[model samples]
Target: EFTQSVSRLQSIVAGLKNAPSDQLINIFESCVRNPVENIMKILKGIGETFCQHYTQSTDEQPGSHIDFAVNRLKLAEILYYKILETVMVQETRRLHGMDMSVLLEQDIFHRSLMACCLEIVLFAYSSPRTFPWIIEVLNLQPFYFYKVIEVVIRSEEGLSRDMVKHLNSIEEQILESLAWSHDSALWEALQVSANKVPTCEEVIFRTGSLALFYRKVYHLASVRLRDLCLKLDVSNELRRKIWTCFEFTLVHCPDLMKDRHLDQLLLCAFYIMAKVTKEERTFQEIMKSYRNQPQANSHVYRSVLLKEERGDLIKFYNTIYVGRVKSFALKYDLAPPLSPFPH
Candidate 1:
């Protein structure tokens, strides 16, 4: 039905290849200022056309002819993404508080927004000739691009060490861009955004049990339990059960170890599992094994496994015990547990 509109967009974008950055910005800015429905129509057309080109790039490794076409389309895609990002920023600014939260909560849209922001940032960083105009248009202050960076960091379950390094370089690039001249407002916004973006380790720990650090901790915790079970002459079947218990407890209650020292909680859980299963492994024995291990050195074991943190460990043990008993009801695939409180 909109064949004409689609062809027009294809032609419009084709010319964008050699168009100056200022010309491209003006074209998109004007395109977005159309009537809301018209803007949506244009956005849809551009997105569909770009999506078609995007899929072509991923179909296979391109030959020489296709490589040129792919490179040209990639440039056009980045430009399209820049416009889409601007549309999101403008729309988001109009929404407030809960409205903005609701917008950001849509996982698909949020992920797309973050990807577009990343592409735009990398594009601007690479093209020094067009960097200033891109920054001016995108408003790279914490409110826009940096906000996307912060959200991406927070929302991701974990960022690899390599990703953290990449982000650090991008941050340094932005800072270096702002360094020569005094731009207090932009500098302050950047600082606040940077502060909200957690350290790589902090990101994983705060993201919950699904992250690498917690998984690694759980692995170490289970190995310690398995070793103790062997020393205590526990059966292989019982050792497996004990491993399941720790994993179940952590999976259900991620915050089970939040405030406590990691070593204290795991050992306590280990003790509780023993008591629950009629094994006679003592807390002293468990602690001794924990401390006596070759990996117990501070440099080898990153978290505080040897330090004795009080109260939290006992509380954690009790917490996991209840979780072990009650959270299981929710685990049965065939039934939903009835609510304890009435609606």
Candidate 2:
């Protein structure tokens, strides 16, 4: 009906060619507004037309292409704002039914306002996102793009009064125990929208278990040793040996990553590594291994490994590495002589 009506209107131009822009706009406004009931359908139709027209400006018709673009843009702009006002009206009506007397006087009103804006933002972001230009035309940024989503989320309880200022970054920290884009076994549908951040205790249990943060720490250490071993022109056997040795200590002694300080963690790693590399009891044996330079060597270069125990931290490494370690070393070529390991 809409298409046929538009074609019939075009025929009117053929008949008299005197129907002004206002006459067409007046007719267009009626179809775009509540007379049609489905705001989304009308919005989508306008978007499809705008997107269709915008996609065709191939620079070959640069002169008249912009005129076509502007025409469609104007049409879309009208329907788009009208539909936006419609969505806001629906959100407003929701609040109108609620008792606004006390809701406005207290902080509860903020949450209500936040909920309304949140839904409207999602509706706005829904479709026709193929072209970023439509978003530009709507001009909904100041109206509330997604700032309230962040606001209401961080404004939840347990945060300090002064912490409100840094709520943006702190909330980010709350989710750091989990990874991005649903990145782990813990990512279950039941907790899909769960706001509970993983407690450090929960992570420590995994640290005690195997291959999470401990895996992270091991990967970090392996890469660091790999970088150094390449520079020292160390043999592949010894490079694997160093990573294997450090990996063993971490995997077995979960206390190292969980309880011990980084200084002690470094101590445990290089203690094992030094023991493994010291094959001087045999003839064809020369070895030197880097320490728990997990984050990197820029901080603690040439540091020693020691704790309250005069006993060797390498005991765990010897027990684990004799039969097996986790896996094979990563395949890497080599970087050129990078100088004396920074100093």
Candidate 3:
């Protein structure tokens, strides 16, 4: 009897799943035609059914909840990708002013919004308890996390000048809204929204500033090393080593220091060099090494002064160091050369 009931339930779900998209929408509309409350109950029933099935499976196997959550998250990600593809096709057709009937049939915009909702829901589901576990299970390589951060920082709506102005307007609106809100939750949500914009801006500004600092330092190091080679009649082999240090610093340090301040670039550079050189040098050891060179102190002073004097740090870095690094193909250059610094 139990098997019969389970099989009947599965059949009913399968039939609903197999129904045409339009048919499903029509069915939902018909059911809720009279009242909004009935629609709410139907939606609640769907959510409860999903949760009940999910919980039952977890109960059958302890520690299987994570697996279930991961599966659902993956499904959500797949839907997001599908929606993105649909939207891209629609955008391309619209750009050419072609008939958008096919694209509209895909319901691109609705699916895209649904994708966002699914992602937010999945994230919420894993929160308050499973958040750390989800992060661990994802085993998100640091590099990928950095890439996502970079994308968010560079997003059109996040970093653009117009977006910033819009955000400022929204912040003022929130302040006014909070003043009028008597409910604690609504006031708190408004405050949270206002705080988030500034937090994102701070992250972007700091990332950009630190990136600029590294480029400035790289240019200073390169120029000083070249000057040293000429003045001291350094061997070609020794000069090559110095160039290697510069290349290593450029590639490894920037990603590592994404969240760091400008001053921290010095430490980042030092760490990168030590790793490249396979030696563990203390801060005192590295400083002592620099002190031994008469030119090194002058180099540091000149570099710091130049960075401070530069009004547009990003433009300077792009025009000087980063541009040069790109031209030189630093990532693939693995030739043996002298250390970038005195140490």
Candidate 4:
């Protein structure tokens, strides 16, 4: 149907609208010979697609009104690739230029909601590597990033590859997503990390004890961080940041994942991290900053139901929170072996 003639549609496309339209096949046809040639211009015109009445309607948007969104439907997979191929032919600078650094650069009041819409459309039609870039460019909110990730997480089809890479990058682990494969003990814990709402008592039959340990620890850790956010009046964007610290603890604390009793240490890490993570610390090496800070000489050595056991917790405070020790498993019995990540 797309290759058919664009006789009447030519006039519709010529009427000063800056975008390509499926109903006006002539618009798309003009660029077919060199699709990549005008992608910058094509993307630049995306905001106009919203201005059209047919796109604004709930129905028939698929016809011509929202061809860019057509990139998302499985049947149109090739068409989406056709659109994305523009990047393959283009130079690196022609690439999406947004990075997460923009979050600190742009004034919060001056950012545009329309840019967010364009980014959502671009990400829907474009690449998953674009995912992080779009977030940086738009200074996307945590709610927005989490919501967008959920979009691909639900489908797990076209998005599975880059989504796994992106999620693994966030978690700092080697994790994969298999849409069809049931579950390995390892994969199940991962699923809990990304999408599942934590109900610590939640049951999944046949899961290994090790997997359950990591899964439940993650759940309790998340609840603790959420409550911590409420207590500190911190912004929700820190949701992902705290989860990063949670995942980092799990990464180093392999012993905790194995010996479920040591699991309380994972809880300890999150509670300390939840309180320590100020905006100034996030851009640097978080643990390194902890090492450089002053000592905490105390008896309260204290602590979350989200409450942590204070027994080994004080050692972590000495090293990770108080900077009194070097914070690896060096004291050996106290905390897990952690990378002395540089600032």
lDDT of 4 by residue, 7-74 (tens): 22222123323332343233323332433334433333432332342234334223334553343222
Question: Which candidate order results from sorting by lDDT in descending order?
Answer: 1, 3, 4, 2
Query: TM per model?
Result: 0.29, 0.25, 0.23, 0.24
Residue 69 CA error for candidate 2 (Å)?
45
Ten-residue stretch with the least lDDT total in model 3: 141-150
After superposition, the stretches of candidate 1 with alpha carbons farther than 4 Å from their true spots are: 1-215, 234-237, 281-284, 295-343
Candidate 4 stretches with Cα past 4 Å from truth are: 1-206, 256-315, 320-343
Clashing pairs in 3: 240-337, 240-338, 241-337, 241-338, 242-338
Worst 10 residues of 2 by lDDT: 334-343
Regions of candidate 2 where Cα sits further than 4 Å from its true position = 1-212, 258-343
Deviation (Å) of 12 in candidate 1: 54
Model 1, range 1-343, lDDT digits (tens) per residue? 4344233334434544422255334433444242334334443554444345434433332222444434544554544444443444456443331133334234334333434433433343342323333234333332223334434434332344444444444433333232212342433433455423222234333452223333334544555565655554443545544555455554444334333333444455556555555555455355445666534443222332222543333444454444554444234333422211101
- Give the Cα RMSD of candidate 2: 21.0
**Backbone clashes, each candidate:** 0, 0, 5, 2
lDDT of each: 0.40, 0.33, 0.34, 0.34
Q: Estimate the overall C-alpha local distance difference test score of candidate 1.
A: 0.40
Give lDDT: candidate 4, residue 187: 38
